[PDB]
Design a protein around this ligand. Structure first.
Ligand SMILES: C=CC[C@@H]1/C=C/C(=O)NC/C=C/C(C)=C/[C@@H](O)C[C@@H](F)Cc2nc(co2)C(=O)N2CCC[C@@H]2C(=O)O[C@@H]1[C@H](C)COC(=O)Nc1cc2ccccc2cn1
Lengths: 56, 142, 209
RNA sequence: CCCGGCGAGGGGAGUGAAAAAGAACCUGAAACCGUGUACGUACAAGCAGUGGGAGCACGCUUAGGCGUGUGACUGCGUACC
RNA sequence: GUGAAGAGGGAAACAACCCAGACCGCCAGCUAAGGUCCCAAAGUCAUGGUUAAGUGGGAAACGAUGUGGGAAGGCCCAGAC
RNA sequence: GAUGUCGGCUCAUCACAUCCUGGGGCUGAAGUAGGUCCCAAGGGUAUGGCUGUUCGCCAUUUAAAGUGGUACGCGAGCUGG
RNA sequence: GCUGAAAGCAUCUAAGCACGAAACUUGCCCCGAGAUGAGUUCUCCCUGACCCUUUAAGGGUCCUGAAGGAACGUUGAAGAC
């Protein structure tokens, strides 16, 4: 239920060896606006695959 | 001055070949472990592998005195509760005759990383042919 | 002898004139093409590598394509190996039909069982359920004891616990052969076989006999 | 003056002997948490050190075969009150 | 007598048993108990015997043409067993 | 300056001085069915009535309803008669 | 049990030989080369130009970026993630 000995800095860091994050490998670029966006997502301005999808 | 110590980067390791036919198991493994460790070299160092590579041929023809050919038992456990298995000297010779020499030598070598490396210099074969002629192994009548 | 690779189409019933209904598992066994033949001089054992079905040319990797091209046969959805019983002889490009099971009378079917996921001891090991009432506190389907006291002081290996159940290789032995329709590449065997509809099956003649 | 939400918090400029004295302010120790560099570490079992000891790195050196850090492998070794 | 209040070596490990009483240092030598095929420092030493049971390396009354040695005796080429 | 007990439930694991199945010798073993001893631990080895019970008596089954060790196995798994 | 001496016989045993059980090793099913002893087979891909230097399994620049993989997305009789 509870520990008999105090774990160490080492074991704490070992457990956190799998806690690191992953950065996006690359950002996609739109044909028309040339903006940078997530793949399969729309841009901040509202474009997607150069078709002027929702902007309002 | 300080006593000499061998360097694993400058140590000379020779290659030898041995025929196990008719040889007594224990009295043979003793000389192997002696050479695999380097006790026969004046440059012997306990924390260094100064031994030599040794090839053993015809491991399926070693001899044992008394009724050990049928009464000697090789026990081993698998980790499960049943676990305990056993095989006689005859059964091992028919299934895997090389393990007889390896097991006898493994017990005569030191326990630990170093002794585990010495065992790697031992090449045991069941027949009279080996594929290490490139190393030009010298005959050893031991 | 050797076996064949097929696909599980489903189950149905075959009515006989004697008023009997035979539950059958329909197995589609298309032409099995030999891609490689192994011997002792090169591989150390006798066997044959086969394939079946089809695959998208734009999805077949170059290594796989070169393996099929060396044999001179189209690509398939996988590769499987069969051993030879000291008297069989095959050649690359040779197509094996379901007619090979015409006079066997019994077969062993191997497949990949359905996946149940993380299963409990009641379902996975047929553990007996505790009391649903009479004071039971949060221990209705739990396993109970898993060992003993200060003696060994550990749980023995192989202890039956909860965990993954299914999605593993399973073989059913000695299934009766009901029909062999080479015109339609069908093999009807009496009974159920592992896996879901559309899964791969390895069909070998019965070894028990 | 600048970034920032006419923010918080910072970077400059300026004051001062000193801003690493900037108001969470003299001095600023330890536990504890971090960045960087060197070495070691993914076939090896236990009070974690000690004795021996290769290699690597670095500083010497009027090459002087010394010093510092690391410590593969190895003998012995079950904390304190 | 030892431990307690005593380390070291040996008995695999083992306060009380065996050897032996640590002022400090040495990469010198001789010994004790105990040991000298390998783990593991030192005789695969020498000589003459015993054991075949891994006895050695767990045990009794009792049982048995196991085997070695010794002191006698009985019946026998008037032919024994 | 806390090692929580009977029995039940759940889950078990080992031993063999073996309950069943398997292999044998003797028999005051005709056969059937038994008695006794030797080998053998691979697997298997009841449900219910009464009682908190273990045990036990009873009813009815079974090829058999084995003997024991495991903190008289198992309450950081349940129950609390 | 056969043959058979020690022991002129006898004797399953000492040499030698043949039968013999759900135990043992295999045969059946599953995992399985982290089997660091890291295995085998088939197939596929890459065929630049220089510089620095304690000059070596060395470092660095430009050009090049394959096989294939991962990522993202639509998803699954696969799945806690
Ligand atoms: C309520 C009230 C009951 C009362 C006291 C309770 C309490 O203090 N709980 C605190 C728990 C302390 C624990 C669990 C301490 C552990 O770290 C060690 C433990 F397990 C070790 C352990 N415990 C136990 C045994 O071994 C044992 O018996 N108990 C343990 C449970 C209660 C019971 C217990 O003591 O019951 C008490 C009863 C009055 C006894 O009745 C008797 O007739 N006793 C008895 C019989 C004797 C016959 C012959 C000679 C002499 C005898 C003398 N005494």
């Amino acid at each position: 239920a509870v520990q008999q000995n105090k774990p160490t800095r080492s074991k704490r860091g070992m457990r956190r060896s799998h806690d690191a994050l992953t950065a996006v490998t690359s950002l996609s670029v739109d044909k028309t606006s040339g903006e940078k966006h997530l793949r399969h997502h729309i841009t901040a301005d509202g474009y997607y695959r150069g078709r002027k999808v929702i902007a309002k | 001055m300080k006593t000499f110590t061998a360097k694993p980067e400058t140590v000379k390791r020779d290659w030898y070949v041995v025929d196990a036919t008719g040889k007594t198991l224990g009295r043979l493994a003793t000389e192997l472990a002696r050479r695999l460790r380097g006790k026969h070299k004046a440059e012997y160092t306990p924390h260094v592998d100064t031994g030599d590579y040794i090839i053993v041929l015809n491991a399926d023809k070693v001899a044992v005195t008394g009724n050990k050919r049928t009464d000697k038992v090789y026990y081993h456990h698998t980790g499960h509760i049943g676990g305990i298995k056993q095989a006689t000297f005859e059964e091992m010779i028919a299934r895997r005759p090389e393990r007889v020499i390896e097991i006898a030598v493994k017990g005569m070598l030191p326990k630990g990383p170093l002794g585990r490396a010495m065992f790697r210099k031992l090449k045991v074969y069941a027949g009279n042919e080996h594929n290490h002629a490139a190393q030009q192994p010298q005959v050893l009548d031991i | 002898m050797i076996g064949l690779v097929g696909k599980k189409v489903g189950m149905t019933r075959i009515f006989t004139e004697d008023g009997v209904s035979i539950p059958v598992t329909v197995i589609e066994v298309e032409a099995n093409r030999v891609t490689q033949v192994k011997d002792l001089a090169n591989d150390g054992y006798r066997a044959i590598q086969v394939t079946t079905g089809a695959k998208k040319a734009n999805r077949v990797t170059k290594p796989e394509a070169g393996h099929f091209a060396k044999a001179g046969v189209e690509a398939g959805r996988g590769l499987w190996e069969f051993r030879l019983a000291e008297g069989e002889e095959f050649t690359v490009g040779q197509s094996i039909s379901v007619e090979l099971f015409a006079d066997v009378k019994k077969v062993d079917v191997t497949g990949t069982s359905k996946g149940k996921g993380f299963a409990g001891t009641v379902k996975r090991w047929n553990f007996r359920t505790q009391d649903a009432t009479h004071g039971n506190s949060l221990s209705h389907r739990v396993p109970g004891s898993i060992g003993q006291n200060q003696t060994p002081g550990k749980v023995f290996k192989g202890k039956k616990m909860a965990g993954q159940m299914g999605n593993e290789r399973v073989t059913v032995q000695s299934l009766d052969v009901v029909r062999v329709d080479a015109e339609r590449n069908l093999l009807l065997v009496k009974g159920a076989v592992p896996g879901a509809t559309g899964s791969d099956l390895i069909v070998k003649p019965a070894v028990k006999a």
